Symmetry: C3
Subunit: 306 residues, 3 copies
């Protein structure tokens, strides 16, 4: 027996997001559907396993869950559970819209209840500290709302989706200023640096969700978001040797969700005949990086360190 570290949900999250990116190429490149289906089935399978393992954690290691929940830093990773649940729902929609819709509502109600209970509680003061100002806060505050937005749009609830989209977008712009100031002043310790990948998530998950809700119209907002997204990509690329100062490790899966979301947005830019060359590069880049994550991960489930 062992208690599953909640951050592991980042793995099926990244693979699910990548399935959806490929799904959106099927009409341009039919073989894309098989690639999407394979990734989607693997993501769903891993999600099922991790859900069962987390159920075990709740039953037999509840005090560990309680402690992560009340931590002003570690609580954020719990949002990965409803986020991944929604993305699995989006995947499954291609086969069974009824089950997909159940998962989407469970994830949406769950994430909203989670943030209403815990994110607001921080405003009581005295628990969260300056050192609690971590990229992971984006998970409950931003990513979860964007995921609800795009999943609700998939179900045909575009205007409700806009509400969640707005919550996520404004929450992002309201937190990032203090996060980047904190990173400038305080050197984030090596053990947390892989979570710098989450800094890439807001702009690309934002544009991906936006394009899902607005019928794929590549407009001025979408281009603005891509621009800041690439800026952050370049910054993180420059920072990569510092990020992995103490070695390559499994936390690097933090980059899969934002990169897959970048790839997803690239399919819409391509369909809209906007920056097609950039779109191709972005889509290929994301896939290569996530492929490397998969390979490094196999070259290790092997050694039994996963």
């Amino acid at each position: 027996p062992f208690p599953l570290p909640t951050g592991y949900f980042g793995i099926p999250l990244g693979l699910a997001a990548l399935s959806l990116a490929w799904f959106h190429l099927e009409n341009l490149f039919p073989a894309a559907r098989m690639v999407s289906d394979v990734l989607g089935i693997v993501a769903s399978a891993v999600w099922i396993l991790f859900i069962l393992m987390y159920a075990y954690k709740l039953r037999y290691y509840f005090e560990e869950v309680r402690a992560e929940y009340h931590s002003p830093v570690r609580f954020s990773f719990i949002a990965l559970i409803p986020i991944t649940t929604m993305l699995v729902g989006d995947i499954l929609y291609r086969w069974n819209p009824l089950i997909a819709e159940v998962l989407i509502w469970i994830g949406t109600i769950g994430q909203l209840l989670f943030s209403t209970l815990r994110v607001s509680e921080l405003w009581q003061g005295g628990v969260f500290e300056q050192k609690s100002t971590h990229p992971s806060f984006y998970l409950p505050a931003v990513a979860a709302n964007f995921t609800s937005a795009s999943s609700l749009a998939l179900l045909g609830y575009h205007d409700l989706g806009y509400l969640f989209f707005g919550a996520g977008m404004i929450a992002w712009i309201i937190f990032e200023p203090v996060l980047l100031q904190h990173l400038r002043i305080s050197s984030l310790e090596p053990q947390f640096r892989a979570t710098m990948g989450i800094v890439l998530a807001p702009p690309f998950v934002c544009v991906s969700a936006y394009l899902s809700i607005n019928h794929g119209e590549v407009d001025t907002l979408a281009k603005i978001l891509w621009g800041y997204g690439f800026l952050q990509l370049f910054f993180l690329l420059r920072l990569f040797p510092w990020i992995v100062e103490k070695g390559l490790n499994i936390g690097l899966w933090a980059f899969s969700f934002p990169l897959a979301s970048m790839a997803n947005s690239a399919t819409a830019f391509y369909h809209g005949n906007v920056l097609q060359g950039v779109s191709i590069f972005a889509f290929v880049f994301s896939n290569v990086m996530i492929g490397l994550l998969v390979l490094m991960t196999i070259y290790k489930l092997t050694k039994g360190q996963f």
Copy 2:
């Protein structure tokens, strides 16, 4: 004799905003006009009284006014005076556009002069402290600009209104990051917690002003603003027992202005056939809460504690 506490202007402010919300239902529900007129007359009457009392304060308790003005925290409540003056102008416009226009210009010039003199002065440093980072700052910095925007639009000056709208919207997004970080780190003392209601003001006053300037077109921006607004509403609802830890008190009128503004925006969403169910719920919720404020207040003007 006594010096009127400047925050009391929040009362006619909330009632005035609520009059305007009902005014905007008259063509859907004719009886709404009588409700609007009654609220508008009560708001105007209370405003007249409070203005006369504040004139008395300026003449006979000037050092108290001077001290509040120079305080890096308490100065903000003075903005309630021109804000309420503008809203009374919007109300009176239905009966006498000439007087309404005088009040709107007096409030607009007044708030702009006030913020130009005092908000900028803070940037000289050394007076404002980290502990000065309070929700009340939204009054001169954000709410006053949105109110000018919507009042100018009422008078037919839409493009000038957009200038004030932009000032308020960007000022909001520029202050909120540091406010929420401060609330996370430092527990706001009980005596100030009722002013957490002002945190609800920016998104709903923003969307209300926006819809006033853009002819009621419920577009993507409006939906985005509503979404963040509801997020903040849910957060504040969860936080309510903490907000009133030391008891229910008259400061809770801080919630009336934002809730009335939410109600106003809901009339436009309803007219635009966007999220009609949400609109109805929001409009009813605001009215019930403000009704409770009125009742608690009567159950007390009685006991002589007002």
Copy 3:
């Protein structure tokens, strides 16, 4: 021999921006073209000189360049070099599009490489301090991106321009919150106060770049930006006696770039028949202020203090 202080590039920057503002009036007021050409030639000439002087600095005072580069505050002024280079390119486009395009690409690649190397490096922590939070950070982070956006648009690359525009706009909104909080708490020392002029740059350079990329369409975003821009103008006007507490000095050229950008945006508002009266006032105001800078500067190159 002497090492040129990098901030001096603000002079040709301001004059170049002003040339472009006048250029945009030529079809309304033909004599505007001669005024534009004169300013453009002077700006270009000064830029050539300063470039040659900075080449000398790199060859013979390299350790001074190294120290400014690694400083978490002084590095920002180096961005003036590619920024001015792009604006000279925009000027020269009227005479030789081939040379103009070379300068625009050199400035764009240069600024992007500069920010990718240095702005991201700050996120490693421990070098940048709270006291490093200065208006000058806007140069590499915001102004350089907007300048690329507008210069790329000039060359016909509107969608690539939108990427740079988005990078600059979001970078602005993400830094300003912490800058204004820092100015409120810590009094900026007199020797740095002239750089308060850079606080005026983001909103006006943003709207100028925006109108360059969107074919001059004066829309809701443009009006919103102008509104916040004027708010900041009024604030800085009120603050001016404090800014020059220790005397008038050459650092006041920090105001030329934002004021010239305001003037440029005013030509587009005027062409669009939006707020024509405001546009005229803004254009005249900027020119008078920059004229005063020129006069104060002559009344001094004289005394040999430049």
